[PDB]
């Protein structure tokens, strides 16, 4: 995953709605249903702060025409007092409202994430050291990192299974991205190109707050060159 840094307080409507927090599932559900009018601004801010990448899968839902929905990091049915806490909101793929929620859904719409979440073992994008928990393989899978304790590995696997991050669709997309990265590596080796001018297209954002999808795979593929590019321009 990628760590998301929040640098915006929120919106006036969201702040006012949080003055009197809901205190049970029914109130949270009803008020979230009634809040549909001012959801667009909150979602716009959330998508801008993430550089247009899904909070869990790092895909460009806009470029695929799948949309976004507002996700609660911690289920509002578990702790409804945070239904309007801006610090507990992110943007996930597969907008809420024929390809939609189902058995194969991933992210906030995944089967496991909808039922229950154990926050002790949950690794998410709002934890500063989440990126070291995961590794991306050459066949499309995502696995826990080797340099992890016997306790951190259990958390990593639990998080991977909770969000259904190893579905066939995600595996195929990640495999294709790896193949394209191999192509680019061979190309720059052949052409005597420089491996920093090209990488700025993929690792450095744009004035419209956009990032290429699968940031972590690209960063992990070019071990030290990616780090040099990131440190130079961030």
């Amino acid at each position: 995953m990628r760590h998301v840094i929040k640098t915006q307080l929120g919106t006036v409507a969201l702040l006012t709605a949080h003055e009197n927090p809901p205190q049970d599932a029914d109130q949270s559900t009803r008020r979230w249903r009634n809040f549909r009018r001012d959801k667009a601004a909150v979602m716009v801010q959330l998508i801008n702060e993430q550089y247009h990448l899904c909070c869990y899968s790092e895909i460009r839902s806009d470029l695929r025409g799948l949309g976004y929905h507002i996700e609660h990091v911690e289920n509002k049915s578990q702790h409804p007092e945070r239904t309007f806490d801006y610090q507990n909101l992110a943007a996930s793929a597969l907008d809420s409202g024929s390809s939609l929620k189902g058995k194969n859904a991933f992210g906030g719409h995944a089967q496991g994430k909808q039922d229950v979440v154990d926050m002790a073992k949950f690794i998410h994008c709002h934890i500063r050291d989440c990126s070291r928990y995961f590794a991306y393989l050459s066949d499309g899978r995502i696995v826990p990192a080797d340099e992890l304790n016997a306790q951190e590995t259990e958390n990593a696997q639990y998080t991977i299974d909770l969000l259904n991050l190893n579905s066939g669709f995600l595996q195929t997309e990640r495999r294709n991205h790896w193949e394209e990265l191999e192509q680019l590596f061979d190309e720059h080796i052949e052409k005597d190109w420089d491996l920093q001018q090209l990488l700025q297209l993929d690792l450095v954002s744009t004035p419209d707050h956009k990032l290429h999808e699968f940031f972590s795979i690209t960063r992990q593929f070019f071990q030290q060159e990616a780090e040099q590019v990131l440190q130079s321009h961030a």
Binding site: S98, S99, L100, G102, K103, S138, V143, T172, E182, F222
Partner: protein
Amino acid sequence: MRIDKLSLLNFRCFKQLDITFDEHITILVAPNGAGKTTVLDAVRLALFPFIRGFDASLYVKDKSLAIRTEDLRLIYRQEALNMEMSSPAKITATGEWASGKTATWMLDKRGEQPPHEDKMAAQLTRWGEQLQKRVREEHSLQQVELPLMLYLGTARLWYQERYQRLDNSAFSRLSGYDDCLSATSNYKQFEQWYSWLWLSYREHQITQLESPSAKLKEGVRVQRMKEAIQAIQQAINCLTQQVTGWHDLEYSASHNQQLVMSHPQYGKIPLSQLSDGLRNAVAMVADIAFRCVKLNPHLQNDAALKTQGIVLIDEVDMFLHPAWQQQIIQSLRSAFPQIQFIVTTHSPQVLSTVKRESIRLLEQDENGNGKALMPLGATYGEPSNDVLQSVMGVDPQPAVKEKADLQKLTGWVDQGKYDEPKTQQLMVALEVALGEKHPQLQRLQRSIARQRLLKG
């Protein structure tokens, strides 16, 4: 006639379901259960009120063409001794009958009471009856065009061996609806009609030759015969000729009174002696083609190309090999380009040839609620393994004994620890177990080389 949406409620497998349909081709995919058969049966049941208006009804006592007490939903609960039904069962259909005539009609059944239908379902019978009336008033200058209904199940090849005119008459025109929604094979009806057609064509040809004084009256009978034959043969060629090379289905008396086909290098051979896939495909296309010819005689050559209707096909790609599976859908859309096809399949080769908006993946939950969704990723023109993993959720790598070792080796190699003796021993063991040319091992070697190159 066209159907845009269907909703089921307390039907066989689904507690509830809503499914829309594409305008030209829709493909249903289901890993578990018999959802696809349920949807096809529901559409077939919703289409029957129209055929009822042509005197085509349960006169042969077809009990499957109505909702039965065996179609309702029964819930078995392990903690209770009693088992109840779910009532009512309902089928609702939305669509179009004529140009600009949109309608919605519903059929329902309550318990053991006789099935009942609403007022639009009765208007659907009235429309068929007025079409019949217009067909019987042939002393007219205007032309009326009839649609096509057809159902092709998995038992369309089971007992092929068990069992005539062509004109603008009501009796001849309404014979195209005979057994059009039947679940059994229809091959001998076609074989007999095609034999009569060929024999009449030849006999009238010789009769005209020996006395052409009837050129203006009998010279246009033979032209109609020839045009019908040509339409049927063109439709069949569109499916068989390019992939297999066989073409021009004919009736031959010198071959023991049999249907024969021609091949450039294999000559003339009877159809019954050809392969299973060829016979299946020929039967499938012939059904539609001669029903089109008989329904709309006034469209001489373009009977197949200018007819409208709905065709349901269960396991469209039966007995066909992967090269043939990559061309069946386009062949069907070329032979009959004005018809709406609803088919079922489980072949990635077929799925790679359509856009993701023509695919419906069916699933259920524990309580019976159903969903018919679209694929999340692109499928049009993609490789077969991509479709197989992304859509059907099947890993192209088979679960052989060495698969787990391969996964472990990949996980170790990609994370930088490839110079350790354990990793190298695993690498050599897998190289001897699967060969050094395995694609995954090759890409792992590429990864090792890249990691070595970076550290410099």
